[PDB]
Subunit: 161 residues, 6 copies
């Protein structure tokens, strides 16, 4: 059971849920809220290590782009990024990050199987971008990148985030 | 709450939800309806552009997209589409799906295909309330072998979830919705953003 | 409606939902249970075939998959499985899961691992009502570094959704 | 012994060796002649076949090759071919080269291109005694960035080695030679083996 | 100076150079002898190790090599080895070659195979004076399609270059030479450095 | 004709050819001198640019190259550079080489490294008459495993070939030569074309 657009907006009014900045009415529709891309990226530098045992001589310094700059996501490359919006969920809501079909049709994955936003989460969401396509994708802060949907839990989470 | 098999049948009978052609009972079980592969495909031509500027000027984006997308591939009967490792291709479900304003659908792949590397979507798997049409698939082969895909094969599964109420802005009424009544392997319309 | 953590423990206590071995409460938070990695693996050997025809049942499974798979790789502890970028490997969860006819399950990854490119499924992530057993994992490394994986590590997260009613053709019947 | 720049000029003056159009003095130095990129290309269409059986039955091989090779791509002036990382493409030199029976030629790339990942051949770089024609290039981009290739750019270098004597079976006289008088981006003729 | 066809035959007749089995006149032309593919192969098993420390402690390097190399694959008659894009595999020439102290040899691929992406070596293509044995090939498919390789196919070419004099330390006399009298698809012996 | 080990030693004694530091006798055999890996490296930063326009406007090319090339990496003693499959990196030989106007040099890899997928060049492997300096290596790992590279390891081999006479336009006298007296892991200077 997902919250329809009208109940998403009612939870935003009520302060049960908060998304800041708040997307316009045009970006809240069906069972989803459209979310945009922020301005902090990282990439991986493999020459420093042979492997990781499942930490961070391998990550770049945070990359913040100048106005009018794009991050170029090349095919076969994983990059970390953030949502522009901060999201705060109550103890009885779980959220689910999904991509956009327009971007999937060019090969952009906006996550890599972890896509659950936990009850009690508060913060911008970290994105793991992967370009499975043939062409480099120029990514710019502020672009629509995904969508979030919200599922109420059976009851309130005892151990929320 | 997802609809169990029995309730999917009841929504289909009531005409709330439609899937055309309607799958037989054998294809509806648990909490999912199996869907089949259509016969329209599209590939990418990288040599004609350096990149795609996703949120660039509409006319530039549009011209880049038209350069990189192949024409639609239609397979005869007996023909396979060979999906090579590392290649992304667009395909389409045989079935058209129509959802009412108070239901959302979700596309998943099949474990039998996944174990060979076949991804049937690339993180966009939601079918919106008010959707009507064939579903475009973005296949990616993450395995070690080419996979021969044939029209009519079972390619994924759809599940359905009731919304908390009817959507106020369902897909069929949204003025800026890009993919209303989509029929073949439709390329990205990111230029309409 | 996902089951929340307290409601996950209830269902386990009832005994229709079961995970064997039973995870400690430390592993059950919010609306998910963390699951662990088993010690059975499979890789592919490309050199014995040109392709696989996915239009099928069972003729592939066998005459295909069986012929392009490794024998089963069982690791002694102290040993790692090295998952190299761009390689797909088959693994299995440590725990066996049994679902009743009125519940569907869903395997997700862990954000901590996904940030390094670990994909724990490849679009098929639904555990059906009536399902009984260890879950097969299809791992894929989308990152830039090999990842060492060790039997027993926390590898993913399961969440659970009640069905609208009990399924009529559940996995054990079908 | 390779011919030094002075001797390459003497062989060209004597008409022993020909390169058409003849490069200017600025392109002939040390032990090499710099060559330029032509404007014909070819790519591969993988989705039409599972594999190529190199020493299989001639008619099956031939049909597979005709399926997988694109039509010839001809670039206008102003146009680039975009060579993406991991992609193999065929191209052709601007120059036609004719060798006598007592000389062998060798194609190399340029360090400036190599340091970006551009390979101009794939382990076949010998130009046989008796050869006459344009040279087909198999480009592979082993780097991290797409490379815009434009007709007319400097793409590699040829050097030349006298043989111990004139070849008895030079290329122009061999009945089973596959590539005599080649002109565009000619695809593999492995089916003629 | 490379030996022309006629002089290759003269060196073979004189027993200065040997190639066993001796290729027929049809395979010796211009400045080269065509060589054929043997029936022994080796692949790599990545899952057993994180990396190879090339100049590490000998025992650690040796243990890593033994873990990553497959057992020798021997093809029956009729059987193909399928070389998929992006895969490196070891193979061997059908012919054994023996060089005297005053000759060096050079392995090239074939343009017909190169045009499909097949590299027959990975920047090591010298056959040393005093060499005796079958030649190990490191195949890499840089193309878009799997290639079916069959024993006995023509895979490459050898040319031969006189040295300025006889080598004082030819391969057959060097104590630390690793690959003397190699016969199957011998894996790297970098651990002997 | 390549110089045999004995003549390489004579050319070095005569000061015709220089290699600094001079390799010991154990590293000079057959027709080659073994060379060793230096301790400077450079990688690529793809996220800063969409592509490189090889024969575009000089200032655009120059700005793109400055964006995509890393700063020089210098490894301490004990440190390895990890070269992952599919990655291209720039490195340098430990040795500086100086060639006279009548000699050309040729860089090859090692069979031991090739059997693990290490390419030490990307089709540009000529050292010109009049060259003086350390040689930049473009490493590519075509194998399945990361390779740990350490400064000082044996990485390849140089051979030498007399020219038909002294070059009139050797590298040290060419005004437009791009890489005279190169010392570290120098990036492509394709912008100087
Ligand atoms: O794999 C998919 C996923 C979705 N759809 C359809 C159903 C869905 O209702 C519609 C829009 O999906 P989404 O909102 O992801 O796409 P968008 O790129 O945001 O398009 P829009 O601008 O119309 O929302 O596309 C497909 O054809 N294939
Ligand atoms: O794409 C994602 C996915 C998740 N998260 C956040 C929201 C979620 O509530 C939290 C934890 O996710 P998960 O439980 O998957 O991470 P973990 O690896 O288990 O770490 P933890 O120990 O924090 O539970 O990470 C993101 O920011 N981006
Ligand atoms: O990553 C997964 C996903 C699913 N399953 C199990 C649970 C699920 O209930 C069953 C069947 O899944 P699915 O319907 O995706 O498989 P299929 O390929 O359609 O096979 P079947 O014909 O058995 O339904 O497989 C796994 O072991 N691993
Ligand atoms: O792997 C190599 C190959 C060459 N060189 C040096 C020696 C050679 O003499 C010089 C120039 O080589 P080339 O002519 O192939 O490079 P270019 O791009 O043509 O530059 P230029 O215009 O200076 O000739 O660079 C290297 O350092 N590394
Ligand atoms: O990069 C190259 C290499 C060679 N050739 C031409 C010149 C050479 O003289 C001829 C044949 O080369 P090769 O003998 O390597 O080709 P093959 O596949 O063996 O063909 P054939 O049966 O004609 O010898 O092809 C090219 O056009 N491009
Ligand atoms: O593709 C090849 C190239 C060479 N060789 C043989 C012939 C050559 O004379 C010998 C040694 O080659 P190289 O010197 O390149 O190998 P190494 O790694 O340096 O070994 P060594 O320490 O024996 O010199 O290996 C092959 O079998 N296959
Ligand atoms: Mg949308
Ligand atoms: Mg199923
Ligand atoms: Mg967690
Ligand atoms: Mg040059
Ligand atoms: Mg030939
Ligand atoms: Mg050696």
């Amino acid at each position: 059971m997902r919250l329809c657009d009208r109940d998403i907006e009612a939870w935003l009014d009520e302060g049960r849920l908060s998304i800041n900045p708040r997307p316009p009415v045009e970006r809240i529709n069906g069972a989803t809220v459209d979310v945009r891309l922020g301005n902090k990226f990282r990439t991986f530098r493999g020459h420093t290590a042979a492997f990781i045992d499942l930490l961070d001589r391998v990550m770049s310094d945070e990359i913040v782009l100048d106005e009018g700059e794009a991050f170029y996501l090349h095919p076969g490359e994983l990059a970390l990024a953030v949502t522009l919006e901060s999201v705060t969920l109550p103890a009885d809501l779980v959220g689910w990050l999904d991509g956009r079909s327009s971007l999937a049709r060019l090969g952009l994955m906006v996550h890599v199987t972890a896509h659950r936003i936990d009850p009690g989460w508060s913060g911008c969401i970290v994105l793991d971008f992967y370009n499975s396509g043939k062409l480099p994708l120029a990514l710019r802060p502020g672009m629509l990148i995904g969508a979030l949907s919200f599922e109420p839990l059976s009851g309130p989470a005892v151990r929320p985030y």
